[PDB]
């Protein structure tokens, strides 16, 4: 049960197929309760999963490395996060902190969610009220299959994943390995992915696009769970009758922000229900549509909504977050366009 | 020169410095990066006018490397410039321009003598009673007494006018030697005489500060930023503008229980009509008032039933639970007595 420093963390988590990370602090009484329990689970599991990088338990002293904790937006202790090959999973571990409960959790997360087809007839009897994604491969031992198996482990909660190999899948491989999305119901045709199947990012992107919405609604009921995903929010606040704002926002996010997809969460929020957050940026529902970023540290305002129509402005807003420009302008006021400087401000 | 400060050396360096100006910065703050040459230039200007060791000390704190020092002084944005006197942080933070002149003029005014010496005791009879006045009658200016007086006046000159009388002049009022006398506002208010040991800084400072600064202040839209800049958490009373009874109770109970905590907490009271939004943060409304809450700038913690202030020790325990981390633990994990995960609110 390893300890992650600011230098060895990327090496360790990337090489771990599954890693359960304990983000703790010494002053958290509940953190100290966990260290023996996290050790015992670590050994119960180290025996059931002996091989190198099958399951890897680590921990992060969030006092020592405030930057690491800031990276995954850890704000309270202890917080247990799941990583697959160095990528944090949306769903935080919120089960009980018992040696038993941790072990059962790792047990599930290590189970194979992919159903292997043994006869192509099975595809005609799939449950069409769920979404189904079928991967047709020459062989299971292929870079193609390994990318697919990664995507399936990340997304099994969102979609059913199936596989077929060799002689079974040959009739569907006229043009090589491919992936078929069977949409729910009977109203749309299958979509076929014949692209960069060794490319995790592109393949993950296409599959994920089929089974989670690009812009989700944040509500009181799902806010905490969305915060637990570890990313800042890019939010459109808008009235329910206001469908044009959402349409514009959805299109500009889809056109401009695909490369940023995994570093920020795209959300929309009913401005009547979110009157209080709108206060924090000196807005009322009458002011909507409003675009804002919520970095958890602060909430930053985009400007006139009609500026989303200007090409690249939405991208630049996201870029200004990650560059630190939005934070700087929040305490120090707008950067110069092209005498001596004032003190930083609480809100400005 | 600009001294870098870590945890191993922070208290030594600032304690020995009669005046220290500290630059709390962060490498990623562009205004911090701009400040570093101006800060070095200002210390060089001031090291010329103030040569002796610990006359004026310019130092800096990389708040990334030393998050705990930053937390100690409630630094939350950069660059923040604080003034210390012999290790004690002055409540007013440096808010002037970050230029060499503005810095230098500020250090020059802080080093200046704020006490006015009176040539004739006729000046105390004609003394302006629209103000708080403290008068020190001394044997000589080379006293140890006067140097404690000088130390207190340097800290509290913004809160009170300090006058001194020496030698032949003060001789009549020194029937019993050196003595300090407070003249409250209004020609009708009686004099209150200091009785403690004038060579004792801690004791003379506390008596003078009690006559100078009210124990409980009202936080308003105007002074909100200033109060935050004092670097102390808030123990605040939310009451209606007409609810004077709750306020009197609060002031009494604070004076009875919390004088030990006077330097670590800011005692405040606020009109809950004009602060409806912060009350909303603790699931309270003006109807729910009176409310007692601590604002720790991380979170806001509710005391419970306002009736419980009258139970001896319960208000003191509220503050103790803040410093012991108990309030923060219970905020994320629920009341103290396998484990449930932490929550952002319970
Ligand atoms: Cl915590
Ligand atoms: Cl900044
Ligand atoms: Cl800053
Ligand atoms: Cl805690
Ligand atoms: Zn907290
Ligand atoms: Zn905790
Ligand atoms: Zn609020
Ligand atoms: Zn900030
Ligand atoms: Zn800054």
Residue numbers in the entry:
A (entry chain C): 2 to 339, 349 to 358
B (entry chain A): 1 to 337, 350 to 358
Please, what does the article write about this entry?
ERp44, a chaperone of the protein disulfide isomerase (PDI) family, cycles between the ER and cis-Golgi compartments to patrol proteins that pass through the BiP and Calnexin/Calreticulin checkpoints. ERp44 traps its clients in the Golgi, retrieving them to the ER via KDEL receptors (KDELR). ERp44 is regulated by the ER–Golgi pH-gradient, which enables the protein to capture clients in the weakly acidic post-ER compartments and release them in the pH-neutral ER32. The present studies reveal that Zn2+ regulates the structure, function and subcellular localization of ERp44, providing a Zn2+-dependent mechanism regulating protein quality control in the ESP.
To reveal how Zn2+ impacts ERp44 conformation at atomic resolution, we determined the crystal structure of the ERp44–Zn2+ complex at 2.45 Å resolution by the single anomalous dispersion (SAD) method using the anomalous signals of Zn2+. The crystallographic asymmetric unit contains four ERp44 molecules, which form two homodimers (dimer 1: Mol A and Mol B; dimer 2: Mol C and Mol D). The overall architecture of the Zn2+-bound ERp44 homodimer resembles two clover leafs aligned tail to tail. The present structure reveals three types of Zn2+ binding sites in the ERp44 homodimer (sites 1, 2, and 3), with a total of five Zn2+ ions aligned close to the dimer interface. Site 1 is formed by the His-cluster in each protomer. Zn2+ (Zn1 and Zn1′) is coordinated by three histidines (His299, His328 and His332) and a water molecule in a tetrahedral geometry (right top). Site 2 is formed at the center of the dimer interface, contributing directly to homodimerization of ERp44. Two antiparallel histidine pairs (His277 and His288) in the mutually adjacent b′ domains coordinate a Zn2+ (Zn2) in a tetrahedral geometry (right middle). Zn2+ at site 3 (Zn3) is coordinated by the Nδ of His333 of one protomer, the thiol group of Cys29 and the main-chain carbonyl oxygen of Tyr74 of the other protomer and two chloride ions. Unlike metal-free ERp44, the Zn2+-bound ERp44 monomer adopts an open conformation in which the C-tail is released from the a domain and the client-binding surface including Cys29 is exposed to the solvent.
